[PDB]
Amino acid sequence: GSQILCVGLVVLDVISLVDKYPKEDSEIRCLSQRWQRGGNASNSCTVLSLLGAPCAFMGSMAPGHVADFLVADFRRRGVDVSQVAWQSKGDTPSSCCIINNSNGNRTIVLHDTSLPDVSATDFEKVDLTQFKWIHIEGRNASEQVKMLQRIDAHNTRQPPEQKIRVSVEVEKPREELFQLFGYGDVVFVSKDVAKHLGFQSAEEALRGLYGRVRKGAVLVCAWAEEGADALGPDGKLLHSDAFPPPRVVDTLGAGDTFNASVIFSLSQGRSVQEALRFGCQVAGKKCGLQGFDGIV
Template sequence: MMSLLCTYRCLSQRWQRGGNASNSCTVLSLLGAPCAFMGSLSAGPVANFIMADFSQRDIDVSAVVLQVEGQTPCACCVVCPSTGTRTVILSDTNLPDVTAEDFSKVHLHQFKWIHWEGRNAEEQVKMIQQVERYNSMLPQQQKITISVEIEKTREPLYQLFPHGDVVFVSKDVARDFGFESAEAALKGLYSRVKQGAILICAWAEKGADALGPDGVIIHSDAFPPESLVDTLGAGDTFNAAVIYTLSKGGSLQDALTFGCRVAGRKCGFHGYDSISKVFDDMQPQSLF
């Protein structure tokens, strides 16, 4: 549920599907990439709304796990129209997360890229290992790319660092390790990722940096809109745009810049749907 506030009066309200991986799927779909979502839901009106919204955006939900226990979590997001900032009040529930056993039922041959939002990391490592075993039987050009997002400052999530071909680490996590810039975080945390991996850290209005196996720091400035309207999901938008570009064979610099451009544009309007309207003039030329 979204509440748009000016001072203390609510000016408008809407329902919006959320969640990091869910939002990234929305953006990928709007950019024209076929994608699927896997997560947990509990049957009821909230789940019905979520599933209908996925369907409206042509996002495959055949792998969604309907749990018999728990409730689908809901958040109230208060957005300030004068600054575009948001306050999130989360009503978290006892809804079980997807397990490695659930993931074992997924037909991996459908996918070229699988992204994990860091949650129940111990189970997610087991899921990733399933993909790694699958990849070991394939030629290089057919292997599934694995990406992980480590956003929350929770110690168990840090075991995901060595399991991604592409690793997104948040500003909050970087600061939790004592780093005060994206560049410092990449240099300090790169030893945690596996050989050949790409480590990416976005730093809000300062843009984003990335570090690959060549040891060269890549940077993109931020592209703020003329006026901030809605920053909710900007990070999820950035991740999706980076994944989109890299999956199309774009360079790391192109991916980083495109991610910052799309995320910046998204902050200039409510929700995500307008991304498709401004996509053509933002797409990296190297992808044509």
């Protein structure tokens, strides 16, 4: 019971670093380029690993030269990949990512291949006893709500001493996913989802959405340079200022760095206030670097 598990996408991020965002129908030359392992649950595994937390990724992956790269990266980072749902149909997805080196803005064109999502069945097939935490990136909702019911069940039959804690990310403003607010002890909702839904602050959002969460759970909302807020059952709003770097050069996967770091801190039994601060602290540190090398 010593590992954290993330369940979501792994994506090849084909990255271009430019010094200003290109105007439509124009042509500019990038400063530098790199390939990076990406996808939300993949990114959080990078971060959890860098923090010293044994973790494991679980997502789909079609065999090929791309996947061979993604996997060589998972190892080397020490991410247990042994839970991957290897596909036959489809290619592994990839993104074009334009990173604006003057403000770290990152723009992403995702080629979501037909590759099929990890399912209730893939999941029903995993040894829950290895994990202290399970984080799920909201993608195939209805099919994941099932993986969530399974974990609750396993919990029921377990001494509070050894229940598996669960967190859930709703990053995309998409209906299918809104049912997912109802699971997990921790629920991450993005600024985009919040805005796409009426609210224009992290505190508004938390008041609004708290009704939708499972009894006793914490709802977390980061808001970039506004920092991040949390709201638990006690009804007290928690806040943390951001730790922006002097020069913000790369925000690609800052949100995932925040999620990972919050998860990490909580899994070490720190308070919600402490973990809020940790998340901003580490996400902010990453925004001042290209990639993840160097956040520790």
